[PDB]
Design a protein around this ligand. Structure first.
Ligand SMILES: [Zn+2]
Ligand SMILES: [Zn+2]
Length: 312
């Protein structure tokens, strides 16, 4: 219904330059201040720390404090100041734009769903990875809960099916959603014990996300010969863990504590892509996601031209 980027155009197409392949990990309930890179006293991201090419952003603010509110905003043209959750799904979003310009879009979801973001695109481009019908990694724990790494299975098939095209893959993580954080990770990540126990479980869940992001990057690396590959991670909101008597998330922005809106963001790219990240301490928000995705595929749109991205 409401358009934002009818003028959008891709400056270069994949027939005259290397095609581009991006994984966008849409994170869940992760707090910036529980990231080792941001000064946390526990090493919650030990695998990512060993990977060259990873930029950590230390000053990122979410649009809101819930999945329902934040996720459509992350893909919106409006920005946090203008965003309206009720009317979001009736507006053209950045995936609509990229799809129209020929970028192959895939959304795998181990969270809930895309909160309206994928609704205008063909049903076949969204896939529910919360069920063992699609996810091959579900029986590794007492709860039979499907794991985020299951979303990486068979992604080569998608690349093959779309070979030579630009591709953007969204992987919507279960991540750190609670309150039962101890359910969110398999036993091999139960590092911080006992499961304060609530904090420990929270940090163990971050370890499993560290693992998932690291494996996402490794998967991308295997395609770097044929594709310009990059990985963007941003959490949809943080989490209160008892500060001032506040717990969980979803607090209205007017009263939301810092903990619920201070989120981690990472960017990784292969050396050959020529993509340059912004400074780690750039003042950033969820508003930066749409311009970042457009830039990664060499797309310009009038509405977002003044906007700061995660990359130059
Ligand atoms: Zn939630
Ligand atoms: Zn969420």
């Amino acid at each position: 219904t409401i358009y934002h980027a009818k003028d959008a155009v891709q400056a270069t197409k994949p027939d005259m330059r290397k095609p581009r392949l991006v994984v966008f990990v849409v994170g869940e309930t992760a707090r910036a201040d529980h990231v080792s890179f941001n000064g946390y006293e526990r090493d919650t991201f030990p695998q990512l720390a060993k990977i060259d090419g990873v930029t950590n952003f230390s000053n990122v603010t979410s649009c809101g404090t819930s999945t329902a509110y934040s996720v459509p905003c992350m893909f919106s043209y409006l920005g946090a100041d203008e965003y309206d959750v009720d009317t979001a799904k009736y507006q053209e979003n950045v995936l609509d734009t990229l799809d129209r310009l020929g970028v192959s879009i895939l959304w795998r979801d181990n969270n809930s769903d895309s909160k309206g973001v994928m609704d205008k695109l063909p049903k076949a481009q969204f896939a529910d990875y919360k069920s063992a019908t699609n996810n091959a990694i579900c029986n590794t724990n007492p709860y039979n809960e499907c794991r985020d790494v299951g979303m990486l299975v068979g992604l080569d098939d998608f690349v093959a099916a779309n070979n030579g095209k630009d591709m953007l893959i969204m992987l919507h993580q279960m991540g750190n959603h609670g309150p039962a954080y101890f359910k969110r990770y398999d036993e091999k990540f139960a590092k911080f014990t006992p499961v304060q126990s609530l904090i420990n479980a929270y940090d163990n869940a971050l370890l499993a996300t560290d693992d998932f992001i690291a494996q996402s990057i490794q998967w991308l690396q295997t395609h770097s010969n044929a594709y310009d590959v990059s990985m963007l991670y941003v959490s949809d909101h943080g989490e209160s863990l008892g500060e001032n008597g506040v717990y969980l998330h979803g607090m209205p922005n007017a009263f939301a504590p810092k903990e619920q809106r201070s989120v981690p963001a990472f960017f990784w790219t292969d050396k050959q892509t020529g993509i340059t990240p912004m400074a780690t301490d750039t003042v950033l928000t969820h508003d930066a996601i749409t311009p970042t995705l457009l830039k990664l595929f060499d797309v310009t749109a009038d509405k977002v031209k003044d906007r700061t991205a995660f990359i130059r």
